[PDB]
Design a protein around this nucleic acid. Sequence first.
DNA 1: ATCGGATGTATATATCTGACACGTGCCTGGAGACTAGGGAGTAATCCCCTTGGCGGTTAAAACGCGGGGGACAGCGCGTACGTGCGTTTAAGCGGTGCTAGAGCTGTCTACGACCAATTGAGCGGCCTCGGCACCGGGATTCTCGA
DNA 2: TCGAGAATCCCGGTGCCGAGGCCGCTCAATTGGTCGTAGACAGCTCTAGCACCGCTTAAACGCACGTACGCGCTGTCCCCCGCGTTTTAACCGCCAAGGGGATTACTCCCTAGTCTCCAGGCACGTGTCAGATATATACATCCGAT
Lengths: 583, 98, 95, 107, 107, 86, 87, 93, 93
Amino acid sequence: LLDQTKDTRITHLLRQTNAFLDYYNVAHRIKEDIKKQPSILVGGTLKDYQIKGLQWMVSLFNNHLNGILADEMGLGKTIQTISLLTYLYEMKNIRGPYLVIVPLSTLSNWSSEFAKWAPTLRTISFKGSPNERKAKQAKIRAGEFDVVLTTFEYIIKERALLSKVKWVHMIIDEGHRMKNAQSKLSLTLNTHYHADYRLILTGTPLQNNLPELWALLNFVLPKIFNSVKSFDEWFNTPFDKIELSEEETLLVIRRLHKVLRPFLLRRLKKDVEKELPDKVEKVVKCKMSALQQIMYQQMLKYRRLRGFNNQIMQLKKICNHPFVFEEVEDQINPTRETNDDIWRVAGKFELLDRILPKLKATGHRVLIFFQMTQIMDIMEDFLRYINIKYLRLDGHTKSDERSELLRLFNAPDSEYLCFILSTRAGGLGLNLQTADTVIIFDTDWNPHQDLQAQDRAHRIGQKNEVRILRLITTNSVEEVILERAYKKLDIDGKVIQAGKFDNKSTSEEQEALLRSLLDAEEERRKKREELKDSEINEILARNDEEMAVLTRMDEDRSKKEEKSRLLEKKREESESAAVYNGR
Amino acid sequence: KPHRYRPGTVALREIRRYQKSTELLIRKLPFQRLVREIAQDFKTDLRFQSSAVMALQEASEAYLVGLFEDTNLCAIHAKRVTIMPKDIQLARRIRGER
Amino acid sequence: RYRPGTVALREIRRYQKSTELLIRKLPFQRLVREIAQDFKTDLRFQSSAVMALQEASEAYLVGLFEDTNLCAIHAKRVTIMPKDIQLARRIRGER
Amino acid sequence: AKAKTRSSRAGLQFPVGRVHRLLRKGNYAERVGAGAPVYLAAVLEYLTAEILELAGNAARDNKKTRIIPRHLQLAVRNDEELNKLLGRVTIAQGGVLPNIQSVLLPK
Amino acid sequence: AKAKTRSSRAGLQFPVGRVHRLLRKGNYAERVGAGAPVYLAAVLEYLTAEILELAGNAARDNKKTRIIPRHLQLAVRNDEELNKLLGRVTIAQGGVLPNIQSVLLPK
Amino acid sequence: RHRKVLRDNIQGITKPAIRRLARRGGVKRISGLIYEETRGVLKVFLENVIRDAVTYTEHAKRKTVTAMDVVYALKRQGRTLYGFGG
Amino acid sequence: AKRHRKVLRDNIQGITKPAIRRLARRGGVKRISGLIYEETRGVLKVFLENVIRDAVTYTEHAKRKTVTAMDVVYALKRQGRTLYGFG
Amino acid sequence: TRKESYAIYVYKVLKQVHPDTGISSKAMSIMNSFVNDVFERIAGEASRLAHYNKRSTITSREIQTAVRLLLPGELAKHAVSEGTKAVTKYTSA
Amino acid sequence: TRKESYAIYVYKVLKQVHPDTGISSKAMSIMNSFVNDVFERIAGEASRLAHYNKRSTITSREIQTAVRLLLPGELAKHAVSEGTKAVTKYTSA
DNA sequence: ATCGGATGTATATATCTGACACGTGCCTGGAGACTAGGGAGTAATCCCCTTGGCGGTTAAAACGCGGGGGACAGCGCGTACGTGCGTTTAAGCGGTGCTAGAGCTGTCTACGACCAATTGAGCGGCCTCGGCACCGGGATTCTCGA
DNA sequence: TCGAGAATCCCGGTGCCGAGGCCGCTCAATTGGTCGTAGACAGCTCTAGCACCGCTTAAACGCACGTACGCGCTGTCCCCCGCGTTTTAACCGCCAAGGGGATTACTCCCTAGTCTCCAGGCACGTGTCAGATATATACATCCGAT
């Protein structure tokens, strides 16, 4: 059936693609396959799957094919790229002027890799005020160079000057920022014109929404935007799932990745380098105060009675933590100083009262991630309220403050268990293994976020266990979204499960992915389906010692028994503070 | 020896500049945050097309320009080359805002 | 003889304390008609209407004084001077 | 049928009939909803009540059983709100509020 | 029958039809005499001619084939009559006429 | 048998009168030059009023100028008086 | 301390001393006394305070949460400040 | 020939305010001019609204809006209060 | 949905004045607002007259009167001249 | 601060006069009773733009800090100006006649309203390409110490 | 004062985008009927401006004259501008759904509108007290003199 439509597109529209100068047969036709590492390769050696996918892309562009790479971080995609380019100058002898573009964050280290590898051939970078620019602008206007490296800023700016010159190959990095259609990169390339070849990268490919595949892929070939509008029909319907997108798109869509097997490489560190010790994964529940519920119920009304722009405002603030507008506390406590009821108000707090102490008693270092970093504000002083050793960082902490603080908490002896973060902003790329423990107050709100929140710790070199620790309160929207993007947690592993056979490029993969898949959904509908911290005490053992001594933390809070758990009423501020929340 | 122009020479040279130039001279945001901040006080939570706000920034900036030039006259008529609040509140006092 | 200006004040009390139009009827009129000559000749004027004009005028002046008064005050001079007037009108924009 | 005036039915002193009539002749909208004339008429009545009370008080200041325009000028110019309202209009036989600039007062 | 536009029949650029229409909707009088709309439309046309000519000249001052509001502000504020007319209204993107008080000029 | 072109009732406007005015206006002591200036302004003001009230009677096509046309003219400039109707 | 941010910049500080200065300059005051800045703010305030209300007023009867450039246009007009360029 | 005014009404209002007080004719006249003035402003404004929101009719509502425009502070407050309340009581019948 | 304006007319007038000159959009907008302004004033005034002299209709005559009001000096002179003359020529047919 | 006065200003005692308030009569103008109608209501979709944090970039705000000159007050003369005081015209009055001109009224007639049928000017959208922004190199001029 | 310092401009060559020019297609302009009528108008009745004289006293005028406010120069000192320095936040590219505003569609409750008629109110008289106004006086506010 529709596989034959696929085939037609394959042969003919491929012919048109190569004019623009399965697929697997016809896409791989042009034969250059080299398992060597090239000559000038210096200062380290591949993990030679790197040779394999290397060679794969080699054939791509020898097949006259651009590419898109899904590879996991820590595999030195950097090198792979580099050595590739070196090869182009090198055995290909092409010496083509090649554009490389990265986020400003890492460009330092990328330069560093030119150092460790190919000072043998030039680079050109850009940053640092007009002067350096106009200088090296003369350099490229001089035309002499080997590599030209930059970030997106001066792409925007000098892009006219850049576009002046013709181009052979063109590299694009963190290419999932191409995620968005009108993110100016693409169209500014239309004006900027183009290089005969191109490449896109991603650490993690993105939402199964999949314009994700489109903007990228369409941008790889004209065939891909027109055909992938016919696949605007197809993928508009890409997901009666068992009647369409489950039983069938095994065939249809999992064979659309079988379509994309010539078009993609992905790899798995813990399959190859396989140094991940473990991560042990949990989510739990909490109560929310009568304010945070009963009033929040009345403040559901107040969501419609600001109290407005509900989701991020109402739902997430209140359903997270209190006095976001502070009349809560102040009206209640004018002294505004830390006190009892800060632990009481949102169950996450009193929880922290029930866990963080044991963390200390178990001495295990914690990194956490947040949104609207203001919540973490409470955290500081909440911690102060016991006076606990901690650090904090947010998206607003400055660059070298960041690098510094990294080193600081990274002190092997650092008295800080708690170094607390903003998810995407503070996180960026990092590996901090001086912390053995991870905790989460918030949704994924797309997975890759808290996937970073996973990949800070147990990325290569953290061999201690990993408790993945989530707070979703009973009868809350974080439940809702939780299983929304957590659907995506079965959705990512699903079409991206197709990515998970195509990674290795072999079908036996997808054959494990059969019940990986269907078993996953089994779990998903086990969700068709209130915690006393006793049980938690019994789940927190990374050894049985932890059990004993923490149960004796409960000797302590046992015999000295600690007030009500939640804020539960007061009642004058019910009506009055209700109407002041009724705005 | 350093190069410093006689006092006020700068000021004049600007006045040439500004009179010779069109655009709104007040930063967009602060003006806005102010505006919304004000509108809070009547009925909350009101979307504002950028255009409308632009208009307000017109009416304001122009309005000021007037108020200066007059208050300028006032101080002149006091034989003082620098304005002082009494001069303002005088000027508004004549336009009757007071 | 009373000290200078004492008279002036005592009047200002008087006038503020009293209603009526302070400008002689006729001269005002002869002026008015004299003016209207210049547009279309020969126009009967009910006394009433003219009365109105004398209102609008006299009041109008009273305003213009009090302001010009302020102006000179702000110049720290207790006696008005033409520059002060033309200043005041200049602010009301008549100029 | 038994007729009676709406103003009576509003218990108010302004003939909403007359008012409404004026409205239509006024070419304001091609049509008139029956609430407007009432509402307005009342408004007027309130206003008049205000100004009257204030002035008449001012008459009592001299204890003059009858009110004169002088009174009107005085009361109106005294109030902040009204004098704000009427500042662009003159009262006939106005006079001006007792007013003195400090600097001109002797020691 | 052969129709043609009155504005053509006036040899003028403003659609007296449209004008008249606006008039009636404007609730001005219950009725409209046919001379008014013509007469007015012409008036407008004259006005526009004035302001345009003056401004466009001011553009030629910098020899700018296109007219910008700055020009408008300049020309209008320059003329006595117009600036008298429009003094109560601001032009967008106005700027202000080159203006200096004598006393502030150096020797 | 009378049309008599009048002469300088502006000069007819008496110094003492203007004085009285400023007195009600509150001014205490007065410069000489003021008289001429004030007279002139008073004039031009009048001109702007009369021209329009006339204009009314013009279109009214009548020999006489009501208090009304005065009033309409005044408001029509933005100055309003009460008590005379309208 | 930190978590309590209640200590913060008042606005109308958002109107910048240099800006105000610049406008006085385009209007042509050459030497400026300091205090004017202060007072200047106050004046501007009243302005908005009168206008925006009335502007909202029309959006008031609009029964539509948004205030477009109209209510500006009009309300200004109802001050006799009527403006051009926007329609 | 008659020429209608509000005078008698004004008078009765005084009888509802300072019932013992007299009024000169001229005063009465002033009151009349005052009233019809205010009336002018109001009708104008309401009319304006009707035009802008493009309705063919004027109700109490528009009126109220205009009132909120013109009469500041206590005027708005007490006033609009009274207009509304009168509308109510009357419209009961 | 269309929103009508005078723009094209303005443009053609320029072609009858400085036919070689361009115009920015924003300028054009200003012109529009200007026009409908003036129009407002005029219509208001004429309407006023119709009210005072108590006629149920507006002709050119009232218009002219109002024109003589607003536009001083050369404006009145040349202008009213043009209005009249246009009325003439057209009204020939 | 008195010495004392001399005058500003409200009180005491009639009363006179004028508009103001009470009684009138009819009238047209507001109220009711009834039908009628699009103008708004009410709601349907559609969809463009609206509110939450982040990475990086610059230009401008913040601020420091001379000296220079402008407020700024002080003060010593003067001349125009406040004033009273005896001169001095004229408005104001009021009263008398004067009519032209306001003001009101029957009439009809051309003219506007209205509509129906007709349509091509104006509008919405779609290229594009010369005016224009910019520039930076270089050409001059304004400033302030000699 | 010339000088060179700093400023500004000038221009030739510099991408770029709204001004404009093009082209379908409607609805709003126009035609030609009609009818109702408002205003022209032409005729009239009587008020209110308007001229003129006698008369009155106020009020304006000239001035005679002190003097007190304006004006000009000096020394002060204080804070503003200029400029350099160093910070920080507008400012723009982004992530991340909800909604309100826009539009159009189909139903009555409201309105105007007609006619009838009964009174509420206005024009219009007429008694009658408010108070304006004139005499007769005493402490309250200036003004030398102590």
